[PDB]
Structure 1
Amino acid sequence: HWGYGKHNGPEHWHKDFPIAKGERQSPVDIDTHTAKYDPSLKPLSVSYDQATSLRILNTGYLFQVEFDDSQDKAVLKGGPLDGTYRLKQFHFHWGSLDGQGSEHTVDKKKYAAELHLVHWNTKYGDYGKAVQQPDGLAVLGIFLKVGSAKPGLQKVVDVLDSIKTKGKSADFTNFDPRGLLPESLDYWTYPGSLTTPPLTECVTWIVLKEPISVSSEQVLKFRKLNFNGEGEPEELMVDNWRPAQPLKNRQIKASFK
């Protein structure tokens, strides 16, 4: 099965998922000098006041916080997007060391982690149909750098010991994702893909320019998760990021400058 190791990591995924070598794969390096300011882009509309978090889950590759997406409670609109995208979940990718962990890079810089808020286009009715479409998902990506703590992240960090191993979940109600956002909503955007199998090319990526600051202790706690299930040898969950992929025939657009 796929994963992040020597024998089943990103460089092997193409054998099961040939789209790994496709024309719109993610993540990518964001060359800030060659990204084009697009005056016709709109401000993002991030409408998260009615978000209903449900559950946090160790998938065996990362952890994710899941929301009620059975109605338009928390939605993403505007920016490069046509229509209404419903928040389904968020998750992170992170490293074994503070200078790696992000999927996107900025002028080749890697951050300690990257937060992904996954949304699906409500014109397709359910998320499983939306993944079959070139404009089915919108993922909002936010970089994490190590510095001062992020208070809005601490509820997430504190529950991780209850979901140490693959397949564990825990109630995670009443969490407000607005606490994970930086001050600015300046962004880059480009068409891309899931960054894990099945690597489907169904994502409009919106990557915020401003990272959030998390403490060394918050990220250390991410690295205490396990890829393995309970009752199996411990494999620390670190380095669950895909490296930058070829940009090919794509332009990254900037909402700013």
Structure 2
Amino acid sequence: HHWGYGKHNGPEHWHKDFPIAKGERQSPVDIDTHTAKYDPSLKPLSVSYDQATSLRILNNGHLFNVEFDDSQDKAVLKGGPLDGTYRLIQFHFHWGSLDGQGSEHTVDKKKYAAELHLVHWNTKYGDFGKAVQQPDGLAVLGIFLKVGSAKPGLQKVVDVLDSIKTKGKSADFTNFDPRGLLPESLDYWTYPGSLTTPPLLECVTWIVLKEPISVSSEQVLKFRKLNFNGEGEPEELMVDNWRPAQPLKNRQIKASFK
């Protein structure tokens, strides 16, 4: 029936319902640090999240999304490789069943335990739905998570997971500050790509941060307790919801640092 991450409906089958899966600018990709072009003209990233307004958290059967009020420039991203302002609409994670896998992008083939995606849309286009019709409609900030010490700013999220265990459940999730999930440095790699889940639209300017954040093993364990299934159905743990690296093709990865 529909898409997932299993043997019968996983990433390798996606092309049947979404032909763009085999397109020219698909994500994720492996970041070869020795081939990435240092670009001195890349301006510093500008993350203005002081007015961020979170609204809800929801398990959609594939992963969980924390949604934000994007009716005004409350939480925006600009600078870096971007032209114009991009509004934060939601953030989600991709993780593995084990600590050695989970991230979508890899750095010199290295896989992290998880990857956080903060999705933004170009205000120039009015709304998210119109933004996904443009080659520069979206900007996703990717942050790697590695297992180590606990991330205080992630605990609020971890605590609420019990209430949205199954597919379709949602919970109010207000007053959450996304600044607590940012690493110290804002150095990054950037390249043009796509969303990593169907519809796999090629509308994304990826900004992948060099420095990962650390979360405890207990924090990641909570992620693995979520369910792909809806309430009452046989239990399928939500793990390994990541897409493998796609061919880079006619693309260049640029770094904002040396």
- Given the two structures, how large is their TM-score scaled by the length of structure 1? 1.00
1:137 aligns with 2:104: no
2:22 maps to which residue?
Answer: 21
1:34 maps to which residue?
Answer: 35
Q: Cα distance, 1:101 vs. partner? A: 0.3
Q: Deviations over 1:139-174 (max 9, x none)?
A: 000000000000000000000000000010001000
Distance in 2 (CA, whole Å) between partners of 1:59 and 1:82 is: 32
1:177 aligns with 2:213: no
1:58 maps to which residue?
Answer: 59
2:216 maps to which residue?
Answer: 215
Alignment RMSD, CA only? 0.4
Q: Cα distance, 1:117 vs. partner? A: 0.2
Distance in 2 (CA, whole Å) between partners of 1:104 and 1:64 is: 19
- Structure 1 segments, 4+ long, off by >6 Å, are none
Distance in 1 (CA, whole Å) between partners of 2:243 and 2:70 is: 27
Q: Deviations over 1:47-75 (max 9, x none)?
A: 00000000000010000100000111000
Q: Cα distance, 1:232 vs. partner? A: 0.7
Distance in 1 (CA, whole Å) between partners of 2:103 and 2:76 is: 24
2:104 maps to which residue?
Answer: 103
Distance in 2 (CA, whole Å) between partners of 1:66 and 1:32 is: 33
Q: Cα distance, 1:243 vs. partner? A: 0.5
The unaligned stretches of length 5 or more in structure 2 are: none
1:252 aligns with 2:253: yes
| SS of residue in 1 equivalent to 2:90 | strand
Q: Deviations over 1:22-64 (max 9, x none)?
A: 0000000000010011000010000000000000000100001
Q: Deviations over 1:112-161 (max 9, x none)?
A: 00000000000000000001110000000000000000000000000000
Q: Cα distance, 1:107 vs. partner? A: 0.3
| SS of residue in 2 equivalent to 1:10 | coil
Q: Cα distance, 1:17 vs. partner? A: 0.5
Q: Cα distance, 1:215 vs. partner? A: 0.4
Distance in 1 (CA, whole Å) between partners of 2:118 and 2:184 is: 16
Distance in 2 (CA, whole Å) between partners of 1:144 and 1:243 is: 17
Distance in 1 (CA, whole Å) between partners of 2:7 and 2:126 is: 38
Distance in 2 (CA, whole Å) between partners of 1:129 and 1:2 is: 24
| SS of residue in 1 equivalent to 2:192 | strand
Seq. identity, %: 98
- Given the two structures, how large is their TM-score scaled by the length of structure 2? 0.99
1:49 maps to which residue?
Answer: 50
The unaligned stretches of length 5 or more in structure 1 are: none
Q: Deviations over 1:147-206 (max 9, x none)?
A: 000000000000000000001000100000000000000000000001000011000000
1:230 aligns with 2:225: no
Distance in 1 (CA, whole Å) between partners of 2:11 and 2:104 is: 12
| SS of residue in 1 equivalent to 2:13 | helix
Distance in 2 (CA, whole Å) between partners of 1:224 and 1:90 is: 19
| SS of residue in 1 equivalent to 2:93 | strand
